[PDB]
Amino acid sequence: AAAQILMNMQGTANLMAIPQRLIFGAKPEELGINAETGQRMFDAYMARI
Amino acid sequence: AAAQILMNMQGTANLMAIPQRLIFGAKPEELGINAETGQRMFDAYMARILAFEGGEGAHAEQFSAAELRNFVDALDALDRKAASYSGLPPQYLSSSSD
Amino acid sequence: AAAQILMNMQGTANLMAIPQRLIFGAKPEELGINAETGQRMFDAYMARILAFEGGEGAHAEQFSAAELRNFVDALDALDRKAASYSGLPPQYLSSSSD
Amino acid sequence: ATLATHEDVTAFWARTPTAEEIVLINRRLAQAERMLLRAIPELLIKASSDPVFRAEVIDIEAEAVLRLVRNHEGYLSETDGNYTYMLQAQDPNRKLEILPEEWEVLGIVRSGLGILVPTVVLPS
Amino acid sequence: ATLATHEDVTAFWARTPTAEEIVLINRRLAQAERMLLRAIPELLIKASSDPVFRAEVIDIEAEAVLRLVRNHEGYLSETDGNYTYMLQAQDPNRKLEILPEEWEVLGIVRSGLGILVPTVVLPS
Amino acid sequence: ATLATHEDVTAFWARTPTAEEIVLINRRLAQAERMLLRAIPELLIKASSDPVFRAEVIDIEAEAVLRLVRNHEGYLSETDGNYTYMLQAQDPNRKLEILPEEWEVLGIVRSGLGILVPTVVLPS
Amino acid sequence: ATLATHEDVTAFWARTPTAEEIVLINRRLAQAERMLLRAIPELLIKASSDPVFRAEVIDIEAEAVLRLVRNHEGYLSETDGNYTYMLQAQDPNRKLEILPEEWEVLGIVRSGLGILVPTVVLPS
Amino acid sequence: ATLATHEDVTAFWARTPTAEEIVLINRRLAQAERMLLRAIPELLIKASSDPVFRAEVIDIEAEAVLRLVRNHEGYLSETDGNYTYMLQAQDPNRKLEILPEEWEVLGIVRSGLGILVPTVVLPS
């Protein structure tokens, strides 16, 4: 029993111990997502808006 | 197991221990973004107030910080297991309050 | 690991330990913003109340301050590891503990 | 000249065009072909090699011009002596465009979920 | 040639077409053929082996065209001094498409619940 | 005389003005020039030195006048014997304005972000 | 007499006025000048020697009357059964006033952010 | 001369313009010409080096002018007792403009995500 709880806790610490951030309504081409990869890089230092 | 928690907690501190700040409904050219670089510097000294023309349902909002204690509450659980399996005094894993 | 938390915490105390102040729906020429500098100086002593001509949806907003404590409880967790791996008396690292 | 022809648009329209409507259709079919060729740079050699694919492109070019020429004069009604008619209402200021469900036939699928990736340069 | 023919479309329309409406119907049926083949490439094997599946495909093609040709001139009303009519309003954006329940009839069906799976590459 | 002339306004319109409308157009053209000259003190120097800049000034002045003088009588409809017309709806359209889109062409741009700055006298 | 004239108002109002409309315009011009002087005591002094400031005040007086004498009878529509008109839905205005932007042209714009300062008398 | 010419606007319009109205088309093309050139400084080098790029500019200028001159009179209806028409509820259509769907064809785009960067001068 305790070994299952330690695995599920560890698995949660990998996938899900943090928020998952979402945006609804913005178009992928309006955000400038690259069509080949589905990603937009942006610089993420502290206080950017 | 504990090394994975320390890795994830440290990456969380580099990426999400601070909130992420957003503005919606403001045109990049209205804010004056430099189109060659996608950015605009502004003076960030204490207590200055930003004012925007935006009215197209325009609003600020933010994603939360991640609570780093959510991982620390798993670190001290694994330290109680490391003490339990090793049989060392709880002092050696810094795990007792006494 | 502890040096990265101290860097990010000290950085956050310089940029983000303050709630940023915003106004939306406000025309710069109505606020009296100087066009050459993008600013207006206003006398900010204590209890003075700002009064604005209200635009069609005009209102004030804030971004949150960052909680510096969200890094400090990771600094406390890393001092707890540094004591465990070194085997010093806990009071050499976690000075306030016991 | 162009993959589709004013006979293709005429066949989908079910009216005989005037000499002005013929030159409009000839100008707009070249615009539709160029608009597809921009997104599928192999188009003209994927076609002819593949005959069922060419048959898609012909009717996509023809329908893309047709919804722009059905009523280009912009009328809602006319009267002439004692004859009179009125049309169903339809959108002003129409533009030559290819719909998502036509891009899917060319095989271009636009994906509605993409991600923003935060980065910071690692120190040295 | 297409599985359905203009005899099917006029049978559901209950009006006789002109030679221009015949050319129009022959092209809308040629779309409905390749609309179905792109979803079900077995279509010609099934519709030659099974007469009930054939009868369903014939009517899905004939209805898919009839949903366009019903009033393709786009009239709301016409009159002279002595006879007049007007019609119940309908949308102008008539476009060749097969309904969700028409896909269920041909035996392919969408799921309205599907899942996004988070993935991270495992270290080595 | 002012930089643009009633031939410019007439050329962006589609009818010859009466000798009455010519006085209105001449009076409005001077007002449009004085508005641009207030914002850009170098206007006549730049319009003498640079022929691309001159073309912008001439056509922004002619646009600014044209949107006032067209239908300046304020009619929605008139009839005359058996003839009749009706126009599209309009705003009060009251007074001369240069658009943000035209100030950008003249090369002057305003930020939609500005900053209120707290201040207190430092003691001595 | 006023700085602007009934010839200035008639330069913008393309309809030439009758003698009743001339006496109206002369009193509305006197009201507009008197309104400007009460805001700017220097007005006649500046307009004695600055030839572009004369054009500001004269065209602003002519505009401030124009927006009040345009259609002052208040008619929407009129007919004799052989001719008729109707107008756009104009604002049924009842006072002379000078716009916020016209005060900015005269150089006396006012800001929309002001402060209320709490105060209490200091003891002795 | 401009890159496109009044025959292009005529060909997309499917109406032969008036001699009073070719003058309008020529000045609207003379705007659209430099309105593109001021956004893409190399435009005339591209449009003489590459004939496929030239065809985009030919279309986009003629479409930008055609949007504006389509029903430039602003009528909704006209009649004399034997004939009548009524048009759709078209736009007030008050400026020459190039669409974002046309700028991306000329190969320039504006990102809808941009960043505000806080900064403070470091001590010294």
mmCIF file of C-alpha atoms in Angstrom, chain G residues 37-96:
data_model
loop_
_atom_site.group_PDB
_atom_site.id
_atom_site.type_symbol
_atom_site.label_atom_id
_atom_site.label_comp_id
_atom_site.label_asym_id
_atom_site.label_seq_id
_atom_site.Cartn_x
_atom_site.Cartn_y
_atom_site.Cartn_z
ATOM 1 C CA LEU G 37 -12.936 87.351 -25.398
ATOM 2 C CA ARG G 38 -14.279 86.210 -21.977
ATOM 3 C CA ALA G 39 -11.954 83.153 -22.202
ATOM 4 C CA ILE G 40 -8.957 85.066 -23.758
ATOM 5 C CA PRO G 41 -8.804 88.819 -22.816
ATOM 6 C CA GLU G 42 -5.820 89.272 -25.230
ATOM 7 C CA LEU G 43 -7.837 88.053 -28.300
ATOM 8 C CA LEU G 44 -8.157 91.400 -30.154
ATOM 9 C CA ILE G 45 -4.496 92.285 -29.369
ATOM 10 C CA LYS G 46 -3.156 88.934 -30.729
ATOM 11 C CA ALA G 47 -5.449 89.248 -33.778
ATOM 12 C CA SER G 48 -4.133 92.835 -34.435
ATOM 13 C CA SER G 49 -0.615 91.620 -35.417
ATOM 14 C CA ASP G 50 -0.517 87.777 -35.839
ATOM 15 C CA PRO G 51 -1.956 87.012 -39.340
ATOM 16 C CA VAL G 52 -2.276 83.217 -38.756
ATOM 17 C CA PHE G 53 -3.969 83.737 -35.351
ATOM 18 C CA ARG G 54 -6.528 85.928 -37.242
ATOM 19 C CA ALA G 55 -7.265 82.907 -39.445
ATOM 20 C CA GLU G 56 -7.709 80.681 -36.322
ATOM 21 C CA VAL G 57 -10.223 82.991 -34.628
ATOM 22 C CA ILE G 58 -12.119 83.960 -37.829
ATOM 23 C CA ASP G 59 -12.592 80.359 -39.039
ATOM 24 C CA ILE G 60 -13.537 79.241 -35.464
ATOM 25 C CA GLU G 61 -16.119 82.069 -35.149
ATOM 26 C CA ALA G 62 -17.486 81.122 -38.594
ATOM 27 C CA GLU G 63 -17.670 77.421 -37.573
ATOM 28 C CA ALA G 64 -19.263 78.186 -34.169
ATOM 29 C CA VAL G 65 -22.100 80.033 -35.995
ATOM 30 C CA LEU G 66 -22.293 77.550 -38.940
ATOM 31 C CA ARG G 67 -23.150 74.560 -36.693
ATOM 32 C CA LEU G 68 -26.092 76.612 -35.257
ATOM 33 C CA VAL G 69 -27.474 78.354 -38.423
ATOM 34 C CA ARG G 70 -27.370 75.136 -40.548
ATOM 35 C CA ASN G 71 -31.053 74.092 -40.861
ATOM 36 C CA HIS G 72 -32.173 76.483 -38.034
ATOM 37 C CA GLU G 73 -35.852 76.125 -39.131
ATOM 38 C CA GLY G 74 -35.713 72.520 -37.758
ATOM 39 C CA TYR G 75 -37.236 70.776 -40.839
ATOM 40 C CA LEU G 76 -36.640 67.037 -41.390
ATOM 41 C CA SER G 77 -38.644 66.841 -44.658
ATOM 42 C CA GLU G 78 -40.738 69.041 -46.967
ATOM 43 C CA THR G 79 -42.777 68.697 -50.224
ATOM 44 C CA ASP G 80 -45.238 70.239 -52.702
ATOM 45 C CA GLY G 81 -46.064 66.818 -54.290
ATOM 46 C CA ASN G 82 -43.790 67.584 -57.326
ATOM 47 C CA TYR G 83 -40.500 68.036 -55.417
ATOM 48 C CA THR G 84 -39.475 66.757 -51.976
ATOM 49 C CA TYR G 85 -36.513 66.152 -49.717
ATOM 50 C CA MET G 86 -35.645 64.650 -46.409
ATOM 51 C CA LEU G 87 -32.484 65.148 -44.372
ATOM 52 C CA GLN G 88 -30.133 62.925 -42.358
ATOM 53 C CA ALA G 89 -31.136 62.795 -38.633
ATOM 54 C CA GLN G 90 -29.336 66.023 -37.523
ATOM 55 C CA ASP G 91 -28.972 66.881 -33.801
ATOM 56 C CA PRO G 92 -31.734 69.447 -32.809
ATOM 57 C CA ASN G 93 -29.152 71.868 -31.308
ATOM 58 C CA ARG G 94 -30.219 74.935 -29.206
ATOM 59 C CA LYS G 95 -26.979 76.757 -28.085
ATOM 60 C CA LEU G 96 -23.713 78.193 -29.452
#
